[PDB]
């Protein structure tokens, strides 16, 4: 009658976009990058091991200076490390120990945390009193907090488990914008280098590219066969990679609006908990549940090196802003800092 013909129109529209995507692809990333020189094995040595956490680590974020990093664990502690000398600058005790995300502000003055409490607490590191105290507890999400990223010192975008992403105004605490369109729990988001857009991967095996200013999704990407666990932008901001629970990563191109390459191997059946890109966009690293952390060559989909020393599921993975290092965090309560040597 009405809803039936409306859904038929929607299906026809999605078929039209599918055939447009099919037509726009002359070839794939393989033949275009078949004659390029392979990266070769990437030997990475654990330089520092930031011991001190007493429970599984769920998230970490590198500071903008590529030296300070914040780490969140189910111990109920937010710790800021001096990755150069393995020093604990701060140890923020969280109100709720069920923390599944953390963030470092680009200015470095603020950090954020959240989790099963549905509240994104923001902490002011630089205070005249000399301690670190929570400045704003953002409430308004219904599901758990999965990821939170800082736009500026005043704007933070959070993705929750209630199929909604949101933009916040910290000084007021109200959601400036609310992003809707996902059907399953949203698990991660990655701000663009230009900061004007951000993508978001959800449990419905789809990733949606939004606009922080306009307020609604622009493009949607499908291809995965299970939950999308972590996502990350390409350094140039014109592509992103997703790490899903079906043991495959995928590289999507925003302008081409479709996937370009899949990073899968028959030896690994575990899901990718975290992904990260190298400073040049040449090495896509990916934390797996096999206790390992592969280092995929983005342009050729050939595994090159493994960060195998973790003993438990790798939950977080971050590459410095200058690319000097790669920290990886795991459920054994230890972060490890890696970088190749000649």
């Amino acid at each position, epitope marked *: 009658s009405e809803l039936d013909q409306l859904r038929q129109e929607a299906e026809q529209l999605k078929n039209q976009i599918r055939d447009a995507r099919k037509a726009c692809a002359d070839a794939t990333l393989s033949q275009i990058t078949n004659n390029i020189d392979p990266v070769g094995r990437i030997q990475m040595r654990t330089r520092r091991t930031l011991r001190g956490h007493l429970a599984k680590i769920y998230a970490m974020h590198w500071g903008t200076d590529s030296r300070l990093l914040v780490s969140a664990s189910q111990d109920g502690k937010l710790i800021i490390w001096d990755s150069y000398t393995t020093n604990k600058v701060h140890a923020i005790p969280l109100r709720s120990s069920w923390v599944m995300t953390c963030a470092y502000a680009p200015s470095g003055n603020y950090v954020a945390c959240g989790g099963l409490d549905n509240i994104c607490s923001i902490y002011n590191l630089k205070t005249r*009193e000399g301690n670190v105290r929570v400045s704003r507890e953002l409430a308004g999400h219904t599901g758990y907090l999965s990821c939170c990223r800082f736009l500026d010192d005043n704007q933070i975008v959070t993705s929750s488990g209630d199929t909604t992403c949101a933009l916040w105004d910290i000084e007021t605490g109200q959601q400036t914008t609310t992003f809707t369109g996902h059907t399953g729990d949203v698990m991660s988001l990655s701000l663009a280098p230009d900061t004007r857009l951000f993508v978001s991967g959800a449990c419905d095996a789809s990733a949606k590219l939004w606009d922080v200013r306009e307020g609604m999704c622009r493009q949607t990407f499908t291809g995965h066969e299970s939950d999308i666990n972590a996502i990350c932008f390409f350094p140039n901001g014109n592509a992103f990679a997703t790490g899903s629970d079906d043991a495959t990563c995928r590289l999507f191109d925003l302008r081409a609006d479709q996937e370009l390459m899949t990073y899968s191997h028959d030896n690994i059946i575990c899901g990718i908990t975290s992904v990260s890109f190298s400073k040049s966009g040449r090495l896509l690293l990916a934390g797996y549940d096999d206790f390992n952390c592969n280092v995929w060559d983005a342009l050729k989909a050939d595994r090159a090196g493994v960060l195998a020393g973790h003993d438990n599921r790798v939950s977080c993975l971050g590459v410095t802003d200058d690319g000097m290092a790669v920290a990886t965090g795991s459920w054994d309560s230890f972060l490890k800092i890696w970088n190749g040597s000649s």
Partner: single-chain antibody
Amino acid sequence: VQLVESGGGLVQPGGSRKLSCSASGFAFSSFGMHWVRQAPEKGLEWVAYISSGSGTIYYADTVKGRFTISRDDPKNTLFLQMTSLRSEDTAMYYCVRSIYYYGSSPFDFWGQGTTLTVSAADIVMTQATSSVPVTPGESVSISCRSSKSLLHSNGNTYLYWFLQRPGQSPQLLIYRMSNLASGVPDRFSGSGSGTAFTLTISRLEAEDVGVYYCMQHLEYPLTFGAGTKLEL
């Protein structure tokens, strides 16, 4: 943030006196606490230091073994017990706070000072000029020099700049030779070559007059410069 000290007064030579620095308005148990004296009509001079948790304690060579410094976290009060007080200990004693971590600003707050009047290897830090007649609206550079290079292996040049306005406690301007402290205008700027250092004020104000001190923090004991005075 407030640091108020008590216990100063007239003490006969060879006697004893007890100085207490009462901290209020900040997490006193997380801040290392120093004592800095200033003899009448002279420059600053470091006295003692106790870390957070009282783990580490240092004394100047002129005072080692004669004064003892202690802190009391529950009461938020810092102590300095004085014995064998001699005529050279008459000075204006300042209570200073400093927290040490990556990117911190040590020596950022100074107490009002307490006056004690007694009746009757180290890095040498040199300021060439003692008084600079200045007028508002121009640029002045304050020059300081060190006997030993302050640029450490890790890349930090541990030199601090303090401004003591007339009848007021010294104020931190620049920490680590380039970083401008909180609450200080951007007109102040510092640069150094590791042994030779300069502090430049872009545009003088009526509140920029005072004595400017250069201090090193490379190793203990901490040594101050003679001081450069700015007058209208």
